[PDB]
Structure 1
């Protein structure tokens, strides 16, 4: 319900324990969530979603720089639907930097302070959909948060800036499949 909780100590296996590209060896300090681990968690997230909404849904995929999460999640949802009825499913998008009388499912990669999603919920509520639930792979424990909690959470992680899987850093760490903590060497290196 609160998701897979990663404690402040000791979170994230060491870098040497998982395959990491040599060119990112110094730009990361610790790995929080290995790729296959995100996969298995997302799979169950597809089930949790499907059993929370049994009426043709609209996958409203929050769209910024990445696609991985909502691509994987929707793949697993498509795997579930692959047994039962000819179930339709519309996937929509919202770019950040129609749904009225529909069962909507907002998909986001990570929530830090919450404002982003909170504001996103307001805009959507105005169109008066039948119901709106939110799914977020990551929800960061931080005093900078406004209190908003998603309906579906993949993992809860320490207040660190992570990259990988679906998260980037100035168009970098795209080929990094692991959600890891970026080090100070990386921040300065890939600074805009």
Structure 2
């Protein structure tokens, strides 16, 4: 494996970007009759969870390439506006269920969701994102904005950490606790 701290790379940055371009084409098609324009009527991107800044930064630029202008708001007026909620990972769906339900109360013209990583096996309630870049199984991943204990968000790929990473850090946490 490329990374000394990982056992597996699941998706490279290049694979993610290729899938993101395919999703951007669909979004450009789906919103083509919405008359989106900078200033007068951008697509409102609502980015949810701290780590989603990486995905949001790459995705709004790719959407711009495909002719979909955006404004961004972070959750870490939309009445009559088109809203696309972005999140780095969708797992239990408890976050997005709450965010979507709250945004609906402001009566946007439409609301859809776009997630970089779906763990469809992780649900605690039923929830389907309109747009999914990639799926993973029920494993804990880091990278592409996703962290372990606030570290590793900067890893360019989505990866599975080595067990020794959690073990060393637990032990150091114990150590610092006693001292």
* Cα distance in structure 2, aligned partners of 1:121 and 1:149: 12
Change (3 A) 1:31 1:71: same
CA deviation after TM superposition for structure 1 residue 141, in Å? 2.9
Choose between structure 1 and 2: higher helix proportion.
2
TM-score w.r.t. length of structure 2: 0.83
* Cα distance in structure 2, aligned partners of 1:75 and 1:190: 36
Please point out which of 12, 19, 30 is paired with 2:8: 30
CA RMSD of aligned residues (A): 1.8
Superposition pairs of residues 7-18 of structure 1, within 5 angstroms? 15=1
Residue in 1 that maps onto 2:73: 92
Higher relative contact order at CA 8 Å, sep ≥6: structure 1 or structure 2?
1
Residue in 2 that maps onto 1:147: 126
| Aligned pairs, number | 163
Please point out which of 53, 63, 75 is paired with 2:61: 75
Residue in 1 that maps onto 2:160: 181
Residue in 1 that maps onto 2:45: 59
Residue in 1 that maps onto 2:24: 46
Contact 2:48 2:74 in 1 (8 A): yes
Contact 2:117 2:136 in 1 (8 A): yes
Runs of 4+ aligned structure 1 residues displaced above 6 Å come to none
Q: Which has the larger radius of gyration?
A: 2
Contact 2:119 2:137 in 1 (8 A): yes
Q: Structure 2: which 5+ residue stretches go unaligned?
A: 37-42, 174-179
TM-score w.r.t. length of structure 1: 0.78
Q: Deviations over 1:108-153 (max 9, x none)?
A: 1001111111011111111111100100011103254422010000
Please point out which of 144, 158, 161 is paired with 2:140: 161
Residue in 2 that maps onto 1:132: 111
Q: Structure 1: which 5+ residue stretches go unaligned?
A: 1-14, 82-86
